C-alpha cells in the first residue's frame, strides 16, 4: 500500500556487500519504538536470517539518540479508551523481537551512538556484538515512570557482577560507554568521530566468521580504561547495601549510613530511590533477583506477565499516572497508588507473577517459538 | 585514554613526517600538509600496522614461509634479527643480503647458478616459494614487488607519500609511514612478538 | 591475467571455481583482511594553528633563541616562539588589547631570558 511509506521511513535499510543495517529514524519521538516499527523490524530480521546471501546484520540509529525506549503514549491513550488489546499486541511483538535478537543465527552488531533507554537496550544487548561510543548513555528509568525494566532487562542486569543490576534497576543510574565496556554490556568501543571508519570497514567484510568480525572491530576500535570516578569503583557499596533481602532494608541501611557517615553518594542514591513508585520498586527487585537463575524465554515470559498485569490496572494505576505526569501534564510530580513502601503487600506483588494461564485464558501468556528456534543462548 | 598513549608512541618515532607532494592514492592516509611536509594520520598507521602484524602472525599457524627483503643499509641489523627469529633454522645470511639484487630471483628461481670467484658471493634462490614477502625497499632497488605480484604472493610493505601507482597497486598490506629507524624497529618488534606468540601457542 | 579485483577476491574466485589449488596464505588473509578506509575526495588541508601569525611575528625579531630544534630529545616540548604565540592567543581570548598582548609577552620572555642568563652566570661562578 501507500500508507506504510511512513513506517519504511521510520525503519530504513542500508545494504552492503553481504550485510544489512536497520536504522531507526523517528526523530520526533527520539527513535521511540511503536508497534509498526517493531513489526517491520521483525519482518526484516526474519527475512535477513532466512537469506543465505547475507552474512551478518546491523542496527543503527539516526540522530543524537540511539533508542529512547518504547513509545508509551499510544499505549496510554489505548488504555484510556478501555480496551487493553493494543498494549498486549505491542508487548508480545516487542518481546518476540527481543527473543529473536537473543537467539539469532547470524552475527548481529548494534551501534549505540547516543541515549539508550528501556527496551532500546533490550533489542541490542542480547546481540552478539555491541559497539559503544563517547555519546552512549545507558539508563533504566522504568521505576520512576511506574513500570518495570522489561524486554529482557531482567536477563542482562541480573547477570552483571555483584548486585549492580539491582542498583541500576532501582535508581535508574546512567552508564557511560567506558563503564558499559567494564560491565561487559558492550563488546567494543570507538569514538563518535571514528564511526565512519569502523562502518566502512564492517560494511565490506565478506566473512561469516564471528572471529573475523570481532578481530576487525577490535582492530578499528579504541582502547579505553574506566576513570577513577566511575561507578565500578564503588561496587563494594552496591554489594553491601543493595544486597539486602528487601527494598525497605536497603533504604533503612542507606538512611542509617546517611545519618552516621553523611555519605554524599548515599544522599544522591536516596534522592534517586525516593522518586520511584513503591510498587514497581518491589516488583523490580523481585524480577531482577528471579531472573538470575533462569533462561531468556522464561525471563521474557514473566516480564510479559508483569507488563500485562500493569496495563490492566489490576492493583494500581501507577503506569497511567506516571505516563501522564511525566509525559502529558509535565508537572513531574506523580502521586502513586501506594504513597509509601509499607502499604505494598506480598499479595499485591504476587499478582504480577501469577500464572495467568491458569485463569482459563490463552492470550494472557507469551507465545515463543522455542521448538523452531531451539534456544541456545 | 590508552589509545592516545599508543598514538603518542607512534608519533615519538616520527613516522608521520612524510615527504611533500603526496600522490593521489596516498591522500587517504594523510592528515594534512605543514612545514613543507606531508603529515600522516598515525591512527590509520596503527590500523594498517595491526592488519599487517595480524596477517603475519596468522601465517605461523599454517607454517608459512616469510621472506624479508631489505635494501636500506640502515635497517640491516633489525631485519637480520627479525629474519633470524622468524625463519628459524631456514635462515641464510648470504641469500638474505644478496639474492634480491638479481632480477628474476623469484620468477626464475630454478635457474642454474655458477660459482665464479670470491665475487659478490654465490647465493641460490629459495627452495620453497614464499607465502609472504616483507619489503623494506624505499628506493626501489629490487624487483621484489613486481615479481611477487607476478607470482600471486602477498606483499607487506611500508609506503612513503611518493610511491608510484604501479607499485602501490601490488602491495597487499600497506603501512603508511616514514621509514625511520625507530618505526622500522617498532614494526619489526611487533611482527616478531606476534609471530613468536602465535608460535608458542602450538608447542613450538 | 584478465581477472579483476584485488588478490583476495581474485584468489577466492579462482579457488572456488577449481582453477587453482588453495595457497597457504589465503586463510591468513581471510582471517585478517587488508585495511580499508573511506573515500577522501583528495583535498588535503593545510594544517594551520590559531597562534601561527604570532609565531611568525616572533620570527620578525631576534632569530637566535634556542638549540631546541637540533637538541633531538623530544618532539613534545614547545619552543619559545610557540609558547609566545599561545600566550598572545590566550591573552586575546581574555579580551586584552593586541599590541599590549605582544608587548607584555615579549617583556615576560625577555625577563625569563635574563633570569636564565643570570642563573647560568651563577653556574659559571660555581664552575
Amino acid at each position: 500500500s501507500a500508507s506504510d511509506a511512513d513506517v519504511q521511513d521510520q525503519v530504513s535499510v542500508e545494504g552492503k556487500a553481504k550485510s544489512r543495517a536497520a536504522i531507526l529514524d523517528r526523530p520526533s519521538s527520539l527513535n521511540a519504538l511503536s508497534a509498526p516499527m517493531v513489526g517491520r523490524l521483525k519482518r526484516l530480521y526474519e527475512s535477513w536470517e532466512e537469506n543465505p546471501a547475507i552474512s551478518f546484520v546491523l542496527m543503527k540509529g539516526s540522530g543524537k539518540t540511539f533508542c529512547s525506549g518504547a513509545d508509551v503514549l499510544p499505549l496510554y491513550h489505548s488504555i484510556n479508551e478501555g480496551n487493553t488489546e493494543e498494549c498486549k499486541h505491542f508487548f508480545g511483538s516487542l518481546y518476540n523481537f527481543v527473543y529473536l535478537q537473543g537467539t539469532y543465527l547470524k552475527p548481529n552488531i548494534a551501534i549505540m551512538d547516543g541515549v539508550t533507554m528501556g527496551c532500546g537496550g533490550g533489542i541490542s544487548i542480547p546481540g552478539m556484538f555491541r559497539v559503544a561510543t563517547d555519546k552512549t548513555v545507558l539508563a533504566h528509568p522504568e521505576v520512576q515512570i511506574g513500570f518495570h525494566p522489561d524486554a529482557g532487562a531482567s536477563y542482562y542486569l541480573s547477570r552483571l557482577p555483584g548486585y549492580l543490576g539491582e542498583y541500576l534497576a532501582l535508581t535508574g543510574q546512567k552508564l557511560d560507554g567506558v563503564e558499559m565496556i567494564a560491565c561487559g554490556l558492550a563488546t567494543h568501543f570507538c569514538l563518535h568521530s571514528r564511526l565512519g571508519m569502523v562502518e566502512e570497514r564492517i560494511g565490506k567484510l565478506l566473512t561469516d566468521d564471528p572471529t573475523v568480525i570481532e578481530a576487525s572491530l577490535a582492530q578499528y576500535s579504541d582502547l579505553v580504561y574506566p576513570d577513577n570516578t566511575s561507578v565500578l569503583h564503588k561496587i563494594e557499596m552496591i554489594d553491601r547495601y543493595f544486597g539486602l533481602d528487601t527494598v525497605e532494608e536497603i533504604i533503612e541501611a542507606m538512611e542509617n549510613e546517611v545519618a552516621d557517615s553523611g555519605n554524599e553518594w548515599c544522599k544522591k542514591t536516596l534522592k534517586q530511590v525516593k522518586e520511584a513508585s513503591p510498587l514497581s520498586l518491589k516488583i523490580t527487585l523481585q524480577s531482577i533477583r528471579e531472573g538470575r537463575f533462569q533462561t531468556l524465554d522464561q525471563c521474557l515470559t514473566r516480564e510479559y506477565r508483569i507488563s500485562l498485569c500493569g496495563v490492566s490496572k489490576t492493583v494500581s494505576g501507577d503506569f497511567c499516572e506516571g505516563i501522564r505526569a511525566r509525559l502529558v501534564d509535565k508537572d513531574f510530580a506523580p502521586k502513586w497508588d501506594p504513597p509509601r513502601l509499607e502499604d505494598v503487600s506480598k499479595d499485591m506483588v504476587d499478582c504480577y507473577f501469577s500464572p495467568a494461564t491458569d485463569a482459563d485464558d490463552s492470550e494472557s501468556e507469551l507465545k515463543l517459538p522455542t521448538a523452531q528456534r531451539e534456544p541456545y543462548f | 585514554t590508552l589509545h592516545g598513549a599508543v598514538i603518542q608512541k607512534l608519533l615519538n618515532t616520527g613516522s608521520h613526517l612524510g615527504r611533500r607532494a603526496a600522490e593521489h592514492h596516498f591522500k587517504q592516509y594523510a592528515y594534512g600538509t605543514r612545514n613543507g611536509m606531508t603529515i600522516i594520520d598515525s591512527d590509520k598507521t596503527l590500523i594498517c600496522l595491526r592488519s599487517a602484524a595480524s596477517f603475519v602472525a596468522n601465517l605461523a599457524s599454517a607454517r608459512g614461509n616469510i621472506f624479508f627483503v631489505n635494501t636500506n643499509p640502515l635497517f640491516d641489523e633489525i631485519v637480520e634479527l627479525t629474519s633470524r627469529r622468524i625463519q628459524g633454522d631456514a635462515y641464510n645470511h648470504n641469500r638474505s643480503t644478496n639474492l634480491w639484487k638479481m632480477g628474476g630471483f623469484l620468477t626464475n628461481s630454478y635457474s642454474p647458478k655458477k660459482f665464479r670467484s670470491r665475487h659478490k658471493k654465490l647465493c641460490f634462490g629459495p627452495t620453497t616459494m614464499p607465502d609472504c614477502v616483507v619489503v623494506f625497499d624505499a628506493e626501489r632497488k629490487s624487483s621484489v614487488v613486481l615479481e611477487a605480484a607476478k607470482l600471486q604472493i602477498p606483499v607487506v610493505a611500508i609506503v612513503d607519500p611518493n610511491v608510484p601507482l604501479e607499485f602501490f597497486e601490488k602491495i597487499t598490506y600497506p603501512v603508511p609511514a616514514r621509514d625511520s629507524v625507530k618505526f622500522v624497529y617498532l614494526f619489526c618488534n611487533v611482527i616478531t612478538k606476534c609471530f613468536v606468540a602465535e608460535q608458542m601457542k602450538m608447542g613450538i | 591475467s584478465w581477472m579483476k579485483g584485488d588478490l583476495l577476491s581474485k584468489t577466492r574466485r579462482l579457488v572456488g571455481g577449481l582453477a587453482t589449488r588453495e595457497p597457504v596464505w589465503l586463510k591468513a588473509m581471510e582471517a585478517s583482511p587488508p585495511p580499508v578506509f573511506p573515500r577522501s575526495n583528495g583535498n588535503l588541508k593545510k594544517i594551520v594553528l590559531p597562534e601561527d601569525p604570532y609565531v611568525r611575528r616572533f620570527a620578525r625579531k631576534h632569530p637566535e633563541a634556542k638549540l631546541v630544534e637540533p637538541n633531538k630529545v623530544s618532539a613534545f616540548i614547545p619552543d619559545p616562539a610557540r609558547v609566545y604565540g599561545c600566550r598572545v592567543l590566550e591573552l586575546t581570548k581574555n579580551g586584552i588589547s593586541e599590541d599590549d598582548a605582544m608587548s607584555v609577552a615579549n617583556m615576560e620572555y625577555l625577563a625569563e631570558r635574563k633570569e636564565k642568563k643570570k642563573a647560568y652566570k651563577r653556574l659559571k661562578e660555581l664552575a
Partner: peptide, 28 residues
C-alpha cells in the same frame, strides 16, 4: 581526525627530520 588534532595542540610535532633539513641545505 581526532587524535592528530589533539596532538597538534601541543609543542612542535611538525619538526622536519635531519635528512630533510640536510637536503634543503643541499639544494640552496
Amino acid at each position: 581526525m581526532h587524535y592528530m588534532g589533539l596532538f597538534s595542540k601541543a609543542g612542535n610535532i611538525f619538526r622536519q627530520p635531519r635528512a630533510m633539513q640536510a637536503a634543503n641545505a643541499m639544494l640552496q
